Protein backbone atom coordinates (compact mmCIF):
# COMPACT_ATOMS: atom_id res chain seq x y z
CA UNK A 1 0.00 0.00 0.00
CA UNK A 2 1.11 3.54 -0.85
CA UNK A 3 0.75 6.23 1.80
CA UNK A 4 -1.91 8.89 1.03
CA UNK A 5 0.23 12.01 1.22
CA UNK A 6 2.92 10.30 -0.84
CA UNK A 7 0.04 9.97 -3.27
CA UNK A 8 -1.00 13.51 -2.52
CA UNK A 9 2.43 15.12 -3.05
CA UNK A 10 3.06 13.14 -6.27
CA UNK A 11 -0.44 13.92 -7.68
CA UNK A 12 -0.53 17.58 -6.66
CA UNK A 13 -0.12 18.60 -10.29
CA UNK A 14 -3.59 17.20 -11.05
CA UNK A 15 -5.21 18.07 -7.63
CA UNK A 16 -4.58 21.79 -8.01
CA UNK A 17 -6.91 21.31 -11.03
CA UNK A 18 -9.68 19.09 -9.56
CA UNK A 19 -8.39 16.24 -11.73
CA UNK A 20 -7.01 13.80 -9.17
CA UNK A 21 -8.77 10.49 -9.88
CA UNK A 22 -6.62 7.86 -8.13
CA UNK A 23 -8.25 7.14 -4.76
CA UNK A 24 -5.72 4.68 -3.41
CA UNK A 25 -2.95 2.52 -4.77
CA UNK A 26 -0.71 -0.38 -3.67
CA UNK A 27 2.56 -1.42 -5.19
CA UNK A 28 5.33 -4.06 -5.44
CA UNK A 29 8.86 -3.47 -6.88
CA UNK A 30 12.12 -5.21 -7.85
CA UNK A 31 15.45 -3.96 -9.25
CA UNK A 32 13.86 -3.59 -12.72
CA UNK A 33 10.06 -3.98 -12.32
CA UNK A 34 7.11 -2.29 -10.69
CA UNK A 35 3.59 -3.66 -10.21
CA UNK A 36 0.71 -1.51 -8.89
CA UNK A 37 -3.08 -1.47 -8.37
CA UNK A 38 -5.25 1.64 -8.05
CA UNK A 39 -8.85 2.52 -7.28
CA UNK A 40 -10.35 5.45 -9.23
CA UNK A 41 -13.34 7.86 -9.37
CA UNK A 42 -14.16 10.58 -11.92
CA UNK A 43 -16.57 13.28 -10.74
CA UNK A 44 -16.94 15.05 -14.08
CA UNK A 45 -14.77 15.88 -17.08
CA UNK A 46 -12.30 18.76 -17.09
CA UNK A 47 -12.25 19.25 -20.91
CA UNK A 48 -15.76 18.49 -22.21
CA UNK A 49 -19.38 18.83 -20.97
CA UNK A 50 -20.32 15.24 -20.31
CA UNK A 51 -20.46 12.08 -22.35
CA UNK A 52 -21.98 9.96 -19.56
CA UNK A 53 -19.10 7.44 -19.93
CA UNK A 54 -15.36 6.78 -19.73
CA UNK A 55 -13.64 8.58 -22.67
CA UNK A 56 -10.17 7.39 -23.73
CA UNK A 57 -8.58 10.66 -22.63
CA UNK A 58 -9.48 9.47 -19.11
CA UNK A 59 -7.74 6.09 -19.58
CA UNK A 60 -4.40 7.88 -20.18
CA UNK A 61 -4.97 10.30 -17.26
CA UNK A 62 -5.59 7.34 -14.95
CA UNK A 63 -2.59 5.42 -16.28
CA UNK A 64 -0.45 8.60 -15.76
CA UNK A 65 -1.61 9.09 -12.18
CA UNK A 66 -1.10 5.39 -11.22
CA UNK A 67 2.33 5.22 -12.85
CA UNK A 68 3.61 8.39 -11.24
CA UNK A 69 2.17 7.00 -7.97
CA UNK A 70 3.76 3.49 -8.36
CA UNK A 71 7.32 4.70 -8.98
CA UNK A 72 7.30 7.10 -6.09
CA UNK A 73 7.77 4.63 -3.16
CA UNK A 74 10.10 2.57 -5.38
CA UNK A 75 12.26 5.69 -5.76
CA UNK A 76 11.72 6.59 -2.12
CA UNK A 77 12.79 3.13 -1.03
CA UNK A 78 15.61 2.85 -3.59
CA UNK A 79 14.19 -0.35 -5.07
CA UNK A 80 14.90 0.34 -8.74
CA UNK A 81 18.58 -0.27 -9.50
CA UNK A 82 18.81 2.31 -12.32
CA UNK A 83 17.07 5.08 -10.23
CA UNK A 84 19.32 4.97 -7.17
CA UNK A 85 20.88 8.43 -7.10
CA UNK A 86 17.42 9.94 -7.11
CA UNK A 87 15.63 10.78 -3.93
CA UNK A 88 11.88 11.37 -3.90
CA UNK A 89 12.78 15.10 -4.25
CA UNK A 90 14.60 14.46 -7.55
CA UNK A 91 11.70 12.27 -8.71
CA UNK A 92 9.13 14.97 -7.89
CA UNK A 93 11.32 17.64 -9.59
CA UNK A 94 11.33 15.58 -12.79
CA UNK A 95 7.66 14.55 -12.99
CA UNK A 96 6.31 17.26 -15.32
CA UNK A 97 9.23 18.20 -17.58
CA UNK A 98 11.13 14.84 -17.85
CA UNK A 99 8.64 11.93 -17.84
CA UNK A 100 7.16 11.36 -21.27
CA UNK A 101 4.96 8.99 -23.22
CA UNK A 102 6.87 7.81 -26.38
CA UNK A 103 4.15 5.45 -27.67
CA UNK A 104 0.80 4.13 -26.44
CA UNK A 105 -1.74 1.54 -27.42
CA UNK A 106 -5.33 1.37 -26.06
CA UNK A 107 -8.37 -0.93 -26.29
CA UNK A 108 -11.90 -0.31 -24.93
CA UNK A 109 -14.57 -2.98 -24.21
CA UNK A 110 -17.71 -2.59 -22.08
CA UNK A 111 -17.43 1.06 -21.25
CA UNK A 112 -16.19 1.76 -17.73
CA UNK A 113 -18.15 3.07 -14.81
CA UNK A 114 -16.29 6.40 -14.49
CA UNK A 115 -17.66 6.64 -10.96
CA UNK A 116 -15.95 3.52 -9.60
CA UNK A 117 -13.20 1.47 -11.25
CA UNK A 118 -9.79 -0.05 -10.69
CA UNK A 119 -6.53 -0.79 -12.61
CA UNK A 120 -3.47 -3.07 -12.69
CA UNK A 121 -0.14 -1.70 -13.89
CA UNK A 122 3.03 -3.56 -14.70
CA UNK A 123 6.28 -2.03 -15.95
CA UNK A 124 9.14 -4.36 -17.00
CA UNK A 125 12.39 -4.48 -18.96
CA UNK A 126 13.49 -0.94 -18.02
CA UNK A 127 16.67 0.11 -19.76
CA UNK A 128 18.83 3.13 -20.35
CA UNK A 129 19.26 4.34 -23.89
CA UNK A 130 19.16 12.36 -25.10
CA UNK A 131 19.89 9.74 -22.45
CA UNK A 132 16.58 8.28 -21.06
CA UNK A 133 14.92 5.52 -19.19
CA UNK A 134 12.66 3.63 -21.54
CA UNK A 135 9.89 2.08 -19.44
CA UNK A 136 7.52 -0.43 -21.17
CA UNK A 137 4.21 -0.62 -19.32
CA UNK A 138 1.01 -2.69 -19.43
CA UNK A 139 -2.24 -1.66 -17.71
CA UNK A 140 -5.82 -3.10 -17.45
CA UNK A 141 -9.01 -1.34 -16.18
CA UNK A 142 -12.16 -2.67 -14.91
CA UNK A 143 -15.17 -2.07 -12.64
CA UNK A 144 -21.04 -3.49 -14.05
CA UNK A 145 -18.53 -5.47 -16.18
CA UNK A 146 -16.33 -3.54 -18.60
CA UNK A 147 -12.62 -3.41 -19.22
CA UNK A 148 -9.92 -1.47 -21.05
CA UNK A 149 -6.16 -1.88 -21.52
CA UNK A 150 -2.71 -0.68 -23.11
CA UNK A 151 0.64 -0.92 -23.69
CA UNK A 152 2.51 2.26 -23.12
CA UNK A 153 6.19 3.09 -23.48
CA UNK A 154 7.51 5.90 -21.33
CA UNK A 155 10.72 7.92 -21.47
CA UNK A 156 12.26 9.29 -18.24
CA UNK A 157 14.87 11.97 -19.12
CA UNK A 158 16.96 12.71 -16.07
CA UNK A 159 18.36 9.77 -14.23
CA UNK A 160 20.37 8.14 -12.71
CA UNK B 1 -12.54 24.61 -45.87
CA UNK B 2 -14.99 24.16 -42.99
CA UNK B 3 -17.08 27.15 -41.93
CA UNK B 4 -16.19 28.58 -38.48
CA UNK B 5 -19.57 28.33 -36.79
CA UNK B 6 -20.00 24.81 -38.16
CA UNK B 7 -16.76 24.31 -36.27
CA UNK B 8 -18.12 26.32 -33.38
CA UNK B 9 -21.42 24.43 -33.03
CA UNK B 10 -19.73 21.02 -33.35
CA UNK B 11 -16.96 21.93 -30.83
CA UNK B 12 -19.21 23.68 -28.31
CA UNK B 13 -18.79 20.76 -25.92
CA UNK B 14 -15.12 21.67 -25.48
CA UNK B 15 -15.54 25.52 -25.82
CA UNK B 16 -17.87 25.75 -22.84
CA UNK B 17 -14.77 24.44 -21.00
CA UNK B 18 -11.97 26.58 -22.52
CA UNK B 19 -10.68 23.46 -24.26
CA UNK B 20 -11.33 24.21 -27.92
CA UNK B 21 -7.95 23.79 -29.66
CA UNK B 22 -8.81 23.43 -33.36
CA UNK B 23 -8.36 26.86 -34.96
CA UNK B 24 -9.45 26.02 -38.47
CA UNK B 25 -9.95 22.92 -40.55
CA UNK B 26 -10.50 21.93 -44.20
CA UNK B 27 -11.93 18.69 -45.48
CA UNK B 28 -12.55 16.38 -48.47
CA UNK B 29 -15.07 13.47 -48.56
CA UNK B 30 -16.31 10.52 -50.66
CA UNK B 31 -19.05 7.90 -50.15
CA UNK B 32 -16.81 6.03 -47.67
CA UNK B 33 -13.82 8.29 -46.84
CA UNK B 34 -13.03 11.60 -45.20
CA UNK B 35 -9.76 13.55 -45.30
CA UNK B 36 -9.16 16.67 -43.17
CA UNK B 37 -6.45 19.13 -42.05
CA UNK B 38 -6.56 21.29 -38.92
CA UNK B 39 -4.53 24.05 -37.30
CA UNK B 40 -4.26 23.97 -33.49
CA UNK B 41 -3.21 26.03 -30.43
CA UNK B 42 -3.14 25.05 -26.74
CA UNK B 43 -3.15 27.93 -24.25
CA UNK B 44 -2.64 25.85 -21.13
CA UNK B 45 -3.70 22.45 -19.81
CA UNK B 46 -7.14 21.80 -18.33
CA UNK B 47 -6.10 18.80 -16.16
CA UNK B 48 -2.53 19.44 -14.93
CA UNK B 49 -0.38 22.47 -13.98
CA UNK B 50 2.04 22.65 -16.86
CA UNK B 51 4.55 20.32 -18.42
CA UNK B 52 5.88 22.90 -20.92
CA UNK B 53 5.15 20.45 -23.79
CA UNK B 54 2.55 18.45 -25.73
CA UNK B 55 1.30 15.58 -23.49
CA UNK B 56 -0.36 12.58 -25.18
CA UNK B 57 -3.71 13.40 -23.60
CA UNK B 58 -3.62 16.45 -25.90
CA UNK B 59 -2.99 14.33 -29.03
CA UNK B 60 -6.30 12.49 -28.47
CA UNK B 61 -8.18 15.73 -27.68
CA UNK B 62 -6.93 17.23 -30.94
CA UNK B 63 -7.75 14.09 -32.93
CA UNK B 64 -11.27 14.12 -31.35
CA UNK B 65 -11.90 17.76 -32.22
CA UNK B 66 -10.64 17.39 -35.85
CA UNK B 67 -12.62 14.19 -36.42
CA UNK B 68 -15.86 15.56 -35.06
CA UNK B 69 -15.16 18.65 -37.22
CA UNK B 70 -14.37 16.65 -40.43
CA UNK B 71 -17.54 14.53 -40.41
CA UNK B 72 -19.81 17.46 -39.81
CA UNK B 73 -19.88 18.98 -43.36
CA UNK B 74 -19.79 15.45 -44.80
CA UNK B 75 -22.99 14.73 -42.85
CA UNK B 76 -24.33 18.18 -43.64
CA UNK B 77 -23.68 17.67 -47.34
CA UNK B 78 -24.80 14.02 -47.35
CA UNK B 79 -21.48 12.83 -48.75
CA UNK B 80 -21.10 9.63 -46.71
CA UNK B 81 -23.34 6.90 -48.14
CA UNK B 82 -23.91 5.10 -44.80
CA UNK B 83 -24.79 8.39 -42.94
CA UNK B 84 -27.54 9.64 -45.25
CA UNK B 85 -30.61 9.68 -43.02
CA UNK B 86 -28.76 11.89 -40.58
CA UNK B 87 -28.94 15.62 -40.77
CA UNK B 88 -26.39 17.79 -38.99
CA UNK B 89 -28.95 17.91 -36.11
CA UNK B 90 -28.85 14.12 -35.73
CA UNK B 91 -25.04 14.21 -35.94
CA UNK B 92 -24.80 16.89 -33.24
CA UNK B 93 -27.32 14.97 -31.04
CA UNK B 94 -25.10 11.89 -31.21
CA UNK B 95 -21.67 13.44 -30.67
CA UNK B 96 -21.25 12.92 -26.90
CA UNK B 97 -23.22 9.75 -26.11
CA UNK B 98 -22.78 7.71 -29.37
CA UNK B 99 -19.31 8.37 -30.85
CA UNK B 100 -16.67 6.24 -29.19
CA UNK B 101 -13.02 5.27 -29.42
CA UNK B 102 -12.75 1.41 -29.56
CA UNK B 103 -8.95 1.25 -29.92
CA UNK B 104 -6.10 3.74 -30.39
CA UNK B 105 -2.41 3.68 -31.14
CA UNK B 106 -0.04 6.67 -30.66
CA UNK B 107 3.60 7.56 -31.35
CA UNK B 108 5.51 10.70 -30.25
CA UNK B 109 8.74 12.08 -31.81
CA UNK B 110 10.20 15.58 -31.39
CA UNK B 111 7.73 16.97 -28.92
CA UNK B 112 5.18 19.33 -30.45
CA UNK B 113 4.96 23.06 -30.07
CA UNK B 114 1.64 23.11 -28.17
CA UNK B 115 1.32 26.76 -29.16
CA UNK B 116 1.20 26.21 -32.92
CA UNK B 117 0.76 22.91 -34.77
CA UNK B 118 -1.24 21.18 -37.46
CA UNK B 119 -2.68 17.70 -38.30
CA UNK B 120 -3.78 15.45 -41.18
CA UNK B 121 -6.65 13.03 -40.68
CA UNK B 122 -7.81 10.23 -42.92
CA UNK B 123 -10.68 7.84 -42.23
CA UNK B 124 -11.27 4.90 -44.63
CA UNK B 125 -13.01 1.54 -44.94
CA UNK B 126 -16.08 2.56 -42.90
CA UNK B 127 -18.48 -0.31 -42.35
CA UNK B 128 -21.55 -1.22 -40.38
CA UNK B 129 -21.29 -4.04 -37.89
CA UNK B 130 -25.08 -3.05 -30.79
CA UNK B 131 -25.17 -1.92 -34.41
CA UNK B 132 -22.33 0.63 -35.08
CA UNK B 133 -20.24 2.38 -37.62
CA UNK B 134 -16.66 1.24 -37.25
CA UNK B 135 -14.43 4.05 -38.53
CA UNK B 136 -10.66 3.32 -38.92
CA UNK B 137 -8.67 6.55 -38.78
CA UNK B 138 -5.06 7.68 -39.28
CA UNK B 139 -3.72 11.06 -38.11
CA UNK B 140 -0.29 12.85 -38.15
CA UNK B 141 0.78 16.00 -36.20
CA UNK B 142 3.46 18.40 -36.77
CA UNK B 143 4.66 22.00 -36.30
CA UNK B 144 10.42 23.66 -34.73
CA UNK B 145 10.30 20.12 -36.21
CA UNK B 146 8.43 17.44 -34.29
CA UNK B 147 5.72 14.98 -35.19
CA UNK B 148 3.25 12.52 -33.70
CA UNK B 149 0.75 10.02 -35.13
CA UNK B 150 -1.99 7.17 -34.63
CA UNK B 151 -4.23 4.85 -35.72
CA UNK B 152 -7.57 5.07 -34.07
CA UNK B 153 -10.72 3.00 -34.51
CA UNK B 154 -13.99 4.71 -33.71
CA UNK B 155 -17.48 3.35 -33.13
CA UNK B 156 -20.54 5.48 -34.08
CA UNK B 157 -23.67 4.00 -32.40
CA UNK B 158 -26.74 5.54 -33.97
CA UNK B 159 -26.89 5.57 -37.71
CA UNK B 160 -28.09 5.34 -40.44
C1 LIG C 1 11.33 6.96 -13.84
C2 LIG C 1 10.05 6.53 -14.53
C3 LIG C 1 8.88 7.03 -13.69
C4 LIG C 1 7.69 6.83 -14.61
C5 LIG C 1 6.35 7.29 -14.07
C6 LIG C 1 5.99 8.39 -15.05
C7 LIG C 1 4.57 8.41 -15.57
C8 LIG C 1 4.51 9.55 -16.55
C9 LIG C 1 3.21 9.43 -17.32
C10 LIG C 1 3.14 10.56 -18.34
C11 LIG C 1 2.76 11.79 -17.93
C12 LIG C 1 2.69 12.91 -18.89
O13 LIG C 1 3.07 12.61 -20.05
O14 LIG C 1 2.30 14.08 -18.55
C1 LIG D 1 -20.12 8.99 -37.70
C2 LIG D 1 -18.67 9.01 -37.28
C3 LIG D 1 -18.32 10.43 -36.86
C4 LIG D 1 -16.99 10.28 -36.17
C5 LIG D 1 -16.39 11.54 -35.58
C6 LIG D 1 -16.35 11.20 -34.10
C7 LIG D 1 -15.09 11.55 -33.35
C8 LIG D 1 -15.31 11.06 -31.94
C9 LIG D 1 -13.98 11.09 -31.22
C10 LIG D 1 -14.18 10.58 -29.80
C11 LIG D 1 -14.69 11.41 -28.87
C12 LIG D 1 -14.89 10.93 -27.49
O13 LIG D 1 -14.62 9.71 -27.31
O14 LIG D 1 -15.34 11.69 -26.56
Q: Where are the domains of chain A?
A: 1-160
Ligand nearest to the CA of A32: 1
Cβ-based burial of B1 (10 A; exposed 0-12, middle 13-18, buried ≥19): exposed
Nearest residue CA, atom 2 of ligand 2?
B156
B88 CB near a chain A CB, below 8 Å?
Answer: no
Q: Is the peptide bond before A5 cis (omega within 30 degrees of 0)?
A: no
Closest CA to A84 of A141, A50, A126, A35: A126
Q: Residue count of chain A, please give it.
A: 160
B100 CB near a chain A CB, below 8 Å?
Answer: yes
Contact by Cβ (8 Å): B135, B154: yes
Instruction: Give the whole-angstrom CA distance, residue A118 versus residue A22.
Output: 9
B66: CB partners within 8 A, 6+ apart: B22, B25, B36, B38, B119, B121, B139
Of B45, B56, B64, the CB nearest to A104: B56
Query: Which residues of chain A neighbour B61 with C-beta distances below 8 Å?
Result: 47, 57
Contact by Cβ (8 Å): B82, A79: no
Sign, CA torsion B32/B83/B92/A19? negative
Q: Which CATH architecture has domain B1-160?
A: Roll (3.10)
Chain A nearest C-alpha distance from B121 (Å):
18
Residue B15 burial (CB count, 10 A): 15
Ligand nearest to the CA of A19: 1
Sign, CA torsion B70/B71/B73/B77? positive
Chain B nearest C-alpha distance from A59 (Å):
9
Q: How many CB pairs under 8 A join A and B?
A: 94
Q: Residue count of chain B, please give it.
A: 160
Amino acid sequence: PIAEELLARVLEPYSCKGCRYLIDAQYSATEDSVLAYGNFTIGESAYIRSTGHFNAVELILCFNQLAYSAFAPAVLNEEIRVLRGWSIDDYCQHQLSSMLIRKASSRFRKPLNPQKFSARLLCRDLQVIWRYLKVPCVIEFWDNGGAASGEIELAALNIP
